[PDB]
Amino acid sequence: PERITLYTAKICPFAQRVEIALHEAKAHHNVEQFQIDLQNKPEWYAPKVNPASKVPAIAYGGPHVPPDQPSPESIKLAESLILVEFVADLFPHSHLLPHDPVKRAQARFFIDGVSTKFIPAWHAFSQGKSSEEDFLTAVEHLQALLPESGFAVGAYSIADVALTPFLGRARVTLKEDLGGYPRGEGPRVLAVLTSGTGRLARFGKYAQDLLARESFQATFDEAYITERYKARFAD
Amino acid sequence: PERITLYTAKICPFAQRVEIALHEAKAHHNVEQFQIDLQNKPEWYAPKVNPASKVPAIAYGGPHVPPDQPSPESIKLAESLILVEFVADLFPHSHLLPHDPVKRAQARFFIDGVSTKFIPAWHAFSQGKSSEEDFLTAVEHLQALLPESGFAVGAYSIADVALTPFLGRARVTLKEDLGGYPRGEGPRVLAVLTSGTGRLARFGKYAQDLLARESFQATFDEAYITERYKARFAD
Ligand SMILES: N[C@@H](CCC(=O)N[C@@H](CS)C(=O)NCC(=O)O)C(=O)O
Ligand SMILES: N[C@@H](CCC(=O)N[C@@H](CS)C(=O)NCC(=O)O)C(=O)O
Numbered sequence: 264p265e266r267i268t269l270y271t272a273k274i275c276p277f278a279q280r281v282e283i284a285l286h287e288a289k290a291h292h293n294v295e296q297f298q299i300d301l302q303n304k305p306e307w308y309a310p311k312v313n314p315a316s317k318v319p320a321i322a323y324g325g326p327h328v329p330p331d332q333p334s335p336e337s338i339k340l341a342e343s344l345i346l347v348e349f350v351a352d353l354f355p356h357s358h359l360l361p362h363d364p365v366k367r368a369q370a371r372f373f374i375d376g377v378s379t380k381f382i383p384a385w386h387a388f389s390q391g392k393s394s395e396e397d398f399l400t401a402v403e404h405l406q407a408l409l410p411e412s413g414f415a416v417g418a419y420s421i422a423d424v425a426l427t428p429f430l431g432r433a434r435v436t437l438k439e440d441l442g443g444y445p446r447g448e449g450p451r452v453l454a455v456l457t458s459g460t461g462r463l464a465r466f467g468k469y470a471q472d473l474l475a476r477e478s479f480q481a482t483f484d485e486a487y488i489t490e491r492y493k494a495r496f497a498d
Numbered sequence: 499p500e501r502i503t504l505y506t507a508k509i510c511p512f513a514q515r516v517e518i519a520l521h522e523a524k525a526h527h528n529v530e531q532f533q534i535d536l537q538n539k540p541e542w543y544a545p546k547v548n549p550a551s552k553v554p555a556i557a558y559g560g561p562h563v564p565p566d567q568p569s570p571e572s573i574k575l576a577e578s579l580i581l582v583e584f585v586a587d588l589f590p591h592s593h594l595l596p597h598d599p600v601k602r603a604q605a606r607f608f609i610d611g612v613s614t615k616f617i618p619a620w621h622a623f624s625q626g627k628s629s630e631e632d633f634l635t636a637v638e639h640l641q642a643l644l645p646e647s648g649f650a651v652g653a654y655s656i657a658d659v660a661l662t663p664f665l666g667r668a669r670v671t672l673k674e675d676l677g678g679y680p681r682g683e684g685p686r687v688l689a690v691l692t693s694g695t696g697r698l699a700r701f702g703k704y705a706q707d708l709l710a711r712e713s714f715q716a717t718f719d720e721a722y723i724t725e726r727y728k729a730r731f732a733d
């Protein structure tokens with residue numbers, strides 16, 4: 264494939280989707296990463312890379328240039344789920360996209376549940392807006408799609424890429440009591456989510472497997488995330 | 499491919515996406531359609547086909563059975579955008595999915611704008627919730643992605659499938675003054691959208707081309723839609 268520059272940020276789970284995808288394709292050492300400071304974005308980022316002014320975004324092809332001077336001739340691409348499929352399409356030996364048309368649809372349907380159920384329910388609960396039960400129910404939607412063993416469609420896929428960055432950050436929030444509830448309530452909900460027992464037993468096992476995946480650990484600065492999350496809660 | 503039963507409804511633009519996709523693949527005469535009455539859904543639909551109780555949904559493979567007695571052995575698939583990619587994946591000579599990985603990402607990015615900008619802005623404006631300007635701005639987002647000529651990525655694609663059912667219904671709403679504004683305001687906004695002149699000139703030409711597409715006209719019961727839309731407004 265042509266040259267890839269990835270504009271990302273350690274804090275952002277949507278960006279980590281693309282870092283995981285690249286690592287699964289064993290291409291993480293072929294791509295140039297540029298870290299965007301989301302509190303002080305470069306003035307050239309929105310006009311020259313991504314008018315939405317968000318990470319992730321990729322610059323594809325074109326000449327060799329410094330990443331803070333992206334070329335007009337590279338193709339600019341945004342939206343994390345689209346970029347994960349692009350990486351899958353460019354590096355087929357990653358095996359991120361299943362060959363079988365039914366398994367592809369089932370992987371993408373799982374992603375739809377991550378998008379429309381897990382993430383909004385996690386955001387609402389972690390922000391103190393909604394109930395614990397609203398979050399757990401959304402998790403049960405995903406659990407019910409899981410096969411008896413393995414990842415979301417058996418073999419690891421784009422489905423697992425989409426979810427994992429949000430799971431790993433939810434763990435930090437809950438482990439550290441940053442979820443807006445009294446001390447100890449965070450850790451109890453974490454245990455429900457990941458113990459492997461109880462109402463979310465099957466999801467718990469799956470969660471253990473997602474967080475053990477090499478690509479996740481390699482793209483996840485737990486110390487940095489935990490520090491940012493404590494500071495944010497402190498306000 | 500194996501046998502396809504499509505559970506659909508004439509009124510539903512999300513379902514029409516899948517009918518268009520099948521017709522572009524020139525497979526509309528190979529699939530069994532079953533019309534779901536959304537005001538009186540069959541008691542077996544949610545438990546046996548789609549627990550979300552929405553159209554579209556596909557039953558794939560399994561034995562030959564009456565469509566009101568779907569088999570446990572067929573694979574049940576839902577979500578219109580996923581089903582459009584499934585149809586593309588099953589009938590490659592449809593040319594719905596571009597070969598080139600960049601063009602695929604650009605087609606899917608256009609779909610993201612249809613999903614996150616056009617449809618919500620159309621819903622809010624047609625329901626009397628928001629301003630005309632909020633709707634037109636969202637249309638301009640899509641316009642800015644269009645190439646100098648052709649469809650969303652040049653050759654017709656899944657991008658055009660995603661948008662067209664909503665455009666054709668918006669036309670009926672606006673042509674017939676069903677948008678919650680005084681007589682004549684609907685038709686004026688239609689002219690902005692589709693005249694080919696003015697602030698939305700390029701989109702207007704594109705809109706003419708989408709509504710002339712054979713697959714759209716063949717899957718669009720304009721008389722039925724117009725009758726349902728007048729009755730709904732009458733309440
Ligand atoms: N829908 C986008 C969302 C990405 C997104 O929200 N990124 C955040 C950080 S995690 C961002 O860059 N925010 C910057 C801003 O809103 O100014 C995707 O999936 O790529
Ligand atoms: N996200 C779904 C939405 C489909 C949808 O909303 N279908 C409507 C009709 S246009 C439906 O079946 N509604 C039935 C109900 O909500 O009870 C998709 O794209 O497939």
Ligand SMILES: Oc1cc(O)cc(/C=C/c2ccc(O)cc2O)c1
Nearest residue numbers: 274275276277300301302386429432
């Ligand atoms: O410093 C900044 C600036 C900014 O604009 C966004 C962010 C973080 C966004 C984010 C984090 C977690 C998540 O689940 C979803 C998110 O969008 C951090």
Ligand SMILES: Oc1cc(O)cc(/C=C/c2ccc(O)cc2O)c1
Nearest residue numbers: 509510511512535536537621664667
């Ligand atoms: O009789 C029924 C029952 C029901 O549950 C939904 C519908 C229509 C839904 C619909 C139409 C247009 C659109 O832009 C979006 C929509 O979801 C009609």
